[PDB]
Design a protein around this ligand. Structure first.
Ligand SMILES: *[C@@H]1O[C@H](CO)[C@@H](O[C@@H]2O[C@H](CO)[C@@H](O)[C@H](O)[C@H]2NC(C)=O)[C@H](O)[C@H]1NC(C)=O
Ligand SMILES: *[C@@H]1O[C@H](CO)[C@@H](O[C@@H]2O[C@H](CO)[C@@H](O)[C@H](O)[C@H]2NC(C)=O)[C@H](O)[C@H]1NC(C)=O
Ligand SMILES: *[C@@H]1O[C@H](CO)[C@@H](O[C@@H]2O[C@H](CO)[C@@H](O)[C@H](O)[C@H]2NC(C)=O)[C@H](O)[C@H]1NC(C)=O
Ligand SMILES: *[C@@H]1O[C@H](CO)[C@@H](O[C@@H]2O[C@H](CO)[C@@H](O)[C@H](O)[C@H]2NC(C)=O)[C@H](O)[C@H]1NC(C)=O
Ligand SMILES: *[C@@H]1O[C@H](CO)[C@@H](O[C@@H]2O[C@H](CO)[C@@H](O)[C@H](O)[C@H]2NC(C)=O)[C@H](O)[C@H]1NC(C)=O
Ligand SMILES: *[C@@H]1O[C@H](CO)[C@@H](O)[C@H](O)[C@H]1NC(C)=O
Ligand SMILES: *[C@@H]1O[C@H](CO)[C@@H](O)[C@H](O)[C@H]1NC(C)=O
Ligand SMILES: *[C@@H]1O[C@H](CO)[C@@H](O)[C@H](O)[C@H]1NC(C)=O
Ligand SMILES: *[C@@H]1O[C@H](CO)[C@@H](O)[C@H](O)[C@H]1NC(C)=O
Ligand SMILES: *[C@@H]1O[C@H](CO)[C@@H](O)[C@H](O)[C@H]1NC(C)=O
Ligand SMILES: *[C@@H]1O[C@H](CO)[C@@H](O)[C@H](O)[C@H]1NC(C)=O
Lengths: 25, 130, 48, 49, 48, 97, 270
């Protein structure tokens, strides 16, 4: 999987980091 | 340079931080355009150098609260804001902690992992305790 | 008055439950104005 | 499972750095909040999923 | 229709200046000696 | 049974290097959320029948009356652009749900 | 200094494909490693541009056939010359071209560019001409037969001076020059290029963009145009050059900008 600021558009972080998802996995 | 300002360049009115670009423009060009077709850089018409334009730092303000049925004490998150920019505005600090989510103010960072209570984001949560 | 009042006003309630609640966005204010234009060169011939 | 959380300053998007555009935007009232409640509703759910 | 408070502003001007008396305008009259509000409510009455 | 299992998991690694379409569902979700933000940004460039898209081109040359006419098209068009993006993102959120 | 020649030098005109020539930077804006869709007056890809060739006088002692005709100018023009010896030295543009109203003169004399907008009474072949090597070991302009009058000049410009010469050699046909001319809402615009080549016959197949060179607020109706060829009332010698003309059209183009923000490739959406 291969993956705006000044227009008021903002990307919020997920609650579980990709480390926490590695832990649950 | 390196300050948030209301600019005008040859009639290009706008607002943001100005900065010295590494981008080279060929001699006939005067504005720099991002993929979005939005302006992102400009040439200085007096000392012909290319300048990056960057937004004046901004973000949501979220208030983290226990119930009013519990307390008046609250914490504030400035979402995606770097702590070094909130002194401009609680800018006394005394309790300030910087995270992937932005700058959190009025909350005490504690190494002890508890169960999540109020979700802040980026692995962080908050709660009301002794 | 304070961030707590700002949430009471955002929620239109004198008591606010537990949680995290959004309020009006923070934004660094423009410190000064700046104007950049070409060097003034060819004046109209008023000496004539 | 999820998608990117997105949140928007409806004022900065419509009217960035203009008080005039802000005062004209007030003529439409609560629509900016209605949008932000909806994008917040999406964004919160992405954690739940 | 009925009104809460009412005023007559009375004055003499040049026939050409009547335009500057409209709301949201500019020129030496509008700028420096008689301004109407943007939310102005009333009637402008003018005659030679 | 173990040798088949061990060989099969090897084929998962080999396959995921090989095919570009494999993760296609996830990539299509990223591509749609990205396309919609870039679409929403590009709508800022549209005139909506105003004399300019740039707010201060309208304000700098006009009075409070003619500016209100012109700016009220841009407010109409841009609010219609957000109500579009948020409708798409709500509908798209139900697919992700 | 305004006398013409009797014989009607008007004669031929050929057809060829402008394959992917006449692309130009549409706006003064940097974009990089990115593709952009734009609509403007562009020269259509593979379109039938006209070749004003100069046929070799196999039978005869000099330039009998030697035309510079009035051509229409609608949506703006793409013009290109294959030209050793600096033969193409300007253009006339406007409506009537007879002093009944205004017109534009563009000239590159041996010393500077000049651009001027007046009710010119243009000579029936407007041109320039030179004295060559004449004891000084220098080249010096002397002939300037372009108009008998220039009554009302509402715009005038001359560049800072330069010393024009032809110097340095390779024997094959060596230089492609290209110009785009547009008139937009009272502003005339010139975009141009020069690039090295080695080719015998046709408009070189390949790709380069034209840079904007100059913009002028002239306001006039350009309906039509003419060029200007170069060398005291009759008898003269002319050197060899040939040129191509096409008319732009309003067409959507997709442009590739490389990392350096230079137009590297293009696609015509039609
Ligand atoms: C505008 O004018 C100034 C001259 O007054 C130019 O800046 C000078 O640049 C030279 C050459 O590097 C320096 O030695 C001088 O110290 C500069 N002068 C000043 C007052 O700073 C400037 O380049 C001109 N603008 C343009 C577009 O050329
Ligand atoms: C907030 O901004 C500051 C700069 O104002 C960042 O501090 C820099 O961090 C890098 C990486 O550690 C260092 O190389 C620089 O020397 C630091 N700059 C200064 C002036 O100290 C800081 O990393 C930023 N924090 C966040 C969370 O974005
Ligand atoms: C070019 O000019 C020459 C001379 O002016 C023309 O030749 C003359 O043509 C007329 C009509 O045929 C004869 O009466 C003359 O005797 C010719 N001159 C001589 C001395 O032979 C020629 O016809 C012109 N050609 C064109 C295409 O205009
Ligand atoms: C090229 O054209 C220019 C423009 O007409 C000529 O410049 C003029 O030259 C005369 C004689 O020296 C001067 O009196 C004028 O004042 C000049 N005009 C300007 C605007 O500078 C130039 O001399 C021409 N060069 C040649 C070789 O013909
Ligand atoms: C964009 O232009 C630059 C400058 O011409 C190119 O960078 C040059 O590349 C050569 C070959 O490696 C080096 O010898 C030069 O020193 C480079 N210039 C600089 C200033 O570093 C670059 O290759 C061009 N990019 C493309 C895609 O054509
Ligand atoms: C809320 O706090 C008040 C005192 O401020 C108390 O009377 C009440 O019982 C509390 N209710 C709950 C639901 O905790
Ligand atoms: C928590 O541990 C970190 C190291 O991981 C240390 O820097 C910090 O001082 C500790 N905090 C407390 C309150 O002990
Ligand atoms: C160019 O168009 C003309 C019509 O003006 C036609 O007669 C000629 O055959 C065409 N040539 C080419 C190469 O398309
Ligand atoms: C040589 O140049 C001078 C001016 O520099 C000119 O007056 C003279 O006529 C020139 N001579 C020839 C033979 O061209
Ligand atoms: C243009 O020329 C005509 C005829 O000579 C004259 O009547 C008119 O005043 C001139 N206008 C200007 C601006 O020189
Ligand atoms: C150009 O043509 C239009 C249409 O006739 C006319 O209004 C305008 O005045 C003309 N300008 C010139 C300089 O010919």
């Amino acid at each position: 999987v291969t993956l705006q600021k000044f227009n008021g558009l903002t990307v919020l972080p997920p609650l579980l980091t990709d480390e926490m998802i590695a832990q649950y996995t | 340079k390196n300050k948030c300002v209301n600019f005008n360049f040859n009639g290009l009115t706008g607002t943001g931080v100005l900065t010295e670009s590494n981008k080279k423009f060929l001699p006939f060009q005067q504005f720099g355009r991002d993929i979005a077709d939005t302006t992102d850089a400009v040439r200085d018409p007096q000392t012909l150098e290319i300048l990056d334009i960057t937004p004046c730092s901004f973000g949501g303000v979220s208030v983290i609260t226990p119930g009013t049925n519990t307390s008046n004490q609250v914490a504030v998150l400035y979402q995606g804001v770097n702590c070094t920019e909130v002194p401009v505005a609680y800018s006394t600090g005394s309790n300030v902690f910087q995270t992937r989510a932005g700058c959190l103010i009025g909350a005490e960072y504690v190494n002890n992992s508890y169960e999540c209570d109020i979700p802040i984001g980026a692995g962080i949560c908050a709660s009301y305790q002794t | 008055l304070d961030p707590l009042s700002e949430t009471k006003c955002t929620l239109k309630s004198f008591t606010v439950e537990k949680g995290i609640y959004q309020t009006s966005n923070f934004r660094v204010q423009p410190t000064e104005s700046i104007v950049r234009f070409p060097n003034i060169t060819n004046l109209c011939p008023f000496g004539e | 499972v999820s998608m990117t959380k997105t949140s928007v300053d409806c004022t900065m998007y419509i009217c960035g750095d203009s008080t005039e555009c802000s005062n004209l935007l007030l003529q439409y009232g609560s629509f900016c909040t209605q949008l932000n409640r909806a994008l917040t509703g999406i964004a919160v759910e992405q954690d739940k999923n | 229709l009925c009104f809460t408070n009412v005023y007559a502003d009375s004055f003499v001007i040049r026939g050409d200046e009547v335009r500057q008396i409209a709301p949201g305008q500019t020129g030496t009259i509008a700028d420096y000696n008689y301004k109407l509000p943007d939310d102005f409510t009333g009637c402008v009455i003018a005659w030679n | 049974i173990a040798n088949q299992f061990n060989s099969a998991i090897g084929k998962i690694q080999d396959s995921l290097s090989s095919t570009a379409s494999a993760l296609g569902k996830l990539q299509d979700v990223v591509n749609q959320n990205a396309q919609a933000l870039n679409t929403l940004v590009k709508q800022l460039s549209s005139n909506f029948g105003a004399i300019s898209s740039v707010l201060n081109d309208i304000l700098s040359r006009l009075d409070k009356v003619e500016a209100e006419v012109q700016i009220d098209r841009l407010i109409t068009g841009r609010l219609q652009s957000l109500q579009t993006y948020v409708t798409q993102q709500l509908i798209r959120a139900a697919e992700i749900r | 200094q305004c006398v013409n020649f009797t014989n009607r030098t008007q004669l031929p005109s050929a057809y060829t494909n402008s394959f992917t020539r006449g692309v130009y930077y549409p706006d003064k804006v940097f974009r990089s490693s990115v593709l952009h869709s734009t609509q403007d007056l562009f020269l259509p890809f593979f379109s039938n541009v006209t070749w004003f060739h100069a046929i070799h006088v196999s039978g005869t002692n000099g330039t009998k056939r030697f035309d510079n005709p009035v051509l229409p100018f609608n949506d703006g023009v793409y013009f290109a010359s294959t030209e050793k010896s600096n033969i193409i030295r300007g253009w006339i543009f406007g409506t009537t071209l007879d002093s009944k109203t205004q017109s534009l003169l563009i000239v590159n004399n041996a010393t500077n560019v000049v651009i001027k907008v007046c009710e010119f009474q243009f000579c029936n072949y407007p041109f320039l001409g030179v004295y060559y090597h004449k004891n000084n070991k220098s080249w010096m302009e002397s002939e300037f037969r372009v108009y008998s009058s220039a009554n009302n000049c509402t715009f005038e410009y001359v560049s800072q001076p330069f010393l024009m010469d032809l110097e340095g050699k390779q024997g094959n046909f060596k230089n492609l020059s290209e110009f785009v001319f547009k008139n937009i809402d009272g502003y005339f615009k010139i975009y141009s290029k020069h690039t090295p080549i080695n080719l015998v016959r046709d408009l070189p197949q390949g790709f380069s963009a034209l840079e904007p060179l100059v913009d002028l607020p002239i306001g006039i109706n350009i309906t039509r145009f003419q060029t200007l060829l170069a060398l005291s009332s009759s008898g003269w010698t002319a050197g060899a050059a040939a040129y191509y003309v096409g008319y732009l059209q309003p067409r959507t183009f997709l442009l590739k900008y490389n990392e350096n923000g230079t137009i590297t490739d293009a696609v015509d959406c039609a």
